[PDB]
Amino acid sequence: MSEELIKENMHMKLYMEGTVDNHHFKCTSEGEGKPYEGTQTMRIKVVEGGPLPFAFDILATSFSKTFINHTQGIPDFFKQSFPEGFTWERVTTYEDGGVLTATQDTSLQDGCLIYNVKIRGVNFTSNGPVMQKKTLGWEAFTETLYPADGGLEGRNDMALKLVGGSHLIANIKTTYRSKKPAKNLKMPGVYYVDYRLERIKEANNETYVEQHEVAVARYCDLPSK
Ligand SMILES: [Cl-]
């Protein structure tokens, strides 16, 4: 491919810290996946602030765009960015008021993918399902990506499962920026990424979490005209 530095099997290391409401936390994680098959596993330790007084679910989407299977010859903005790497900035707005901003740096060091994530969430109400930890993982979802603001932008709603069977919806806005100059990049048009983010295991009040993701990029295959 274009992306020779990105192998069929890749390891990753992640550093995460920040705050939700008045609550500081810090996590580390390590994992591996298959970047061209669109699959990955992450093993996460909460190392400061644990056990967290909020649903770990609100952090889950912040643990990896190199591991998307780009089908149908869709140009791969993330894989093309290496060795330089890329960043993202995101805001997630929960329909019951919580707002979580996240920024991430993605680099490649000696064959390993290194993530640095900073999180700041505010206005999660004490009585809500997040702060009361009444959440049960996300439904499968699809990101829409399109070229904008000198990079890629992403958009999508997501549905958080709650105990009792109902859902809490969040709307997500992301901006992705390559550290490689845009003249060295084959830019995609509008495309879609199908996601399934699943919790595999949790130990000690969500102090240890294993997470799995499958991600497949595609066009819309509906008949046209
Ligand atoms: Cl959507």
- Whole-number Å distance, alpha carbon 144 to ligand 1 midpoint, is 7
Structure-determination technique: X-ray
How many whole angstroms separate alpha carbon 197 and alpha carbon 130?
A: 18
Header resolution in angstroms: 2.2
Q: How does DSSP classify residue 158? A: E
- Whole-number Å distance, alpha carbon 184 to ligand 1 midpoint, is 30
- Whole-number Å distance, alpha carbon 94 to ligand 1 midpoint, is 14
- Of the candidates 219, 56, 49, 62, the residue with the CA atom closest to the CA atom of residue 145: 219
How many whole angstroms separate alpha carbon 4 and alpha carbon 77?
A: 14
- Whole-number Å distance, alpha carbon 16 to ligand 1 midpoint, is 26
* CATH architecture, domain defined by 1-225: Beta Barrel (2.40)
DSSP, residue by residue, 171-212: EEEEEEEESS-GGG-----SEEEEEEEEEEEEETTTTEEEEE
- Whole-number Å distance, alpha carbon 167 to ligand 1 midpoint, is 15
Count other C-beta atoms under 10 Å from residue 5's C-beta: 12
Q: Which residues surround ligand 1, an ion (CB under 5 A)?
A: 156-157
